[PDB]
């Protein structure tokens, strides 16, 4: 068969930051060539593996994670990076074997009023663990007094949405991010490049 990497990259819609969307790719053969050919990607940064030897390598599983963040926050999606998104919304381990790819999505992910469909985890009590998702909508108990379900002084919504206007600057302009995590457990190698 053929690995459906392109479906992830060419998906019509992409997941929000508040919940990254992950698809596990297994028992297929992929050409990493199509990814490196395309000039669409603004960010092609590989951590823990050289891109050249990827086709030669065989991986037990290959996970593709999809989300849409503001362009500057793309730098946050990297090993050992401290930020609101990296610490809370989506986290990458210090030992990371995979690549981060990103392209501008202002053509599709922005409206004149702004798209509020994609949101980030503004407040969380503890930093999220690597490769973990939390969609909790409990109001942040910033105050000593409990929130008791009401938005109030020292009480804050867990999430806040980007407002994506095409006129907005590149950092605030949307960027679409695919994270490729390469998994080599002590298991049979399901995914390999034909070469």
């Amino acid at each position: 068969n053929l690995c459906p990497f392109g479906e992830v990259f060419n998906a019509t819609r992409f997941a929000s930051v508040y919940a990254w969307n992950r698809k596990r790719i297994s028992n297929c053969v992929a050409d990493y060539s199509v990814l490196y050919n395309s000039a669409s990607f603004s960010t092609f940064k590989c951590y823990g593996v050289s891109p050249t030897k990827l086709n030669d390598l065989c991986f037990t599983n290959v996970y593709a994670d999809s989300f849409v963040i503001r362009g500057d926050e793309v730098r946050q999606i990297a090993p050992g990076q401290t930020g609101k998104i990296a610490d809370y919304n989506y986290k990458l381990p210090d030992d990371f074997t995979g690549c981060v790819i990103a392209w501008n999505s202002n053509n599709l992910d922005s409206k004149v009023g702004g798209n509020y469909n994609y949101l980030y985890r503004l407040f969380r009590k503890s930093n999220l663990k690597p490769f973990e998702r939390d969609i909790s909508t409990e109001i942040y108990q910033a105050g000593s007094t409990p929130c008791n379900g009401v938005e109030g002084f020292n009480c804050y919504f867990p999430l806040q949405s980007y407002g994506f206007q095409p006129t907005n600057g590149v950092g605030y302009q949307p960027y679409r991010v695919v994270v490729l995590s390469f998994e080599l457990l002590h298991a049979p190698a399901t995914v390999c490049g034909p070469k």
Epitope: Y47, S50, P51, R75, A78, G80, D94, G171
Partner: antibody, heavy 128, light 107 residues
Amino acid sequence: QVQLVQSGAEVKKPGASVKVSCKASGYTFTRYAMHWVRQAPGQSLECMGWINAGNGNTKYSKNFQGRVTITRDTSANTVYMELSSLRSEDTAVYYCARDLYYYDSSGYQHINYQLDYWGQGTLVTVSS
Amino acid sequence: VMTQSPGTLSLSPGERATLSCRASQSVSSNYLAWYQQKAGQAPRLLIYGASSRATDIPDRFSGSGSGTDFTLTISRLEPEDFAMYYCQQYGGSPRTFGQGTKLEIKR
């Protein structure tokens, strides 16, 4: 936590050699790179060079070149800066900092400009 | 070098302070990063990439990027904010650190 620990303050006679050590903790030593930045008293920061802990590969600034050697020990997660033939102008505070290295699609290593964490700083007084 | 102005920028408590870094070929669409240095202590990063903040940085700190130049913003001034602030980027020559601006408050 992520901790960078630097050697104690040093007093050295002119023309001698200073060796300043930066310990690493809380992160994978090989996966990040170490930069050394010097602050002369009441002056701006200057990046002397960068060590890649995995590769051992070194690059140096031209102004400080000819005196600075930056080394590494994989075992103790400790990076060393050595400066030699100290001039009086050399007296400064020297810092160690951590930069992620990334890989381009062609496979060549590159340094992320961000200096995420900093060492406490070792002071070198050069006095007759 | 990178133009960080002035050598001293002074601001009243509760006011908003703006620190400016400008360069032509250093920025070159590359990233600009800001650090905070308290008196007698090593620099601590405040903003990386001019719009993203590390953890343990209060929300009052904020940044912007405008082509050749970028800025550091402290909307609310507190005694703790008293420090020397720096800007960094990469150029054709190795990475460049700005001269730095000292922030002062009325007391």
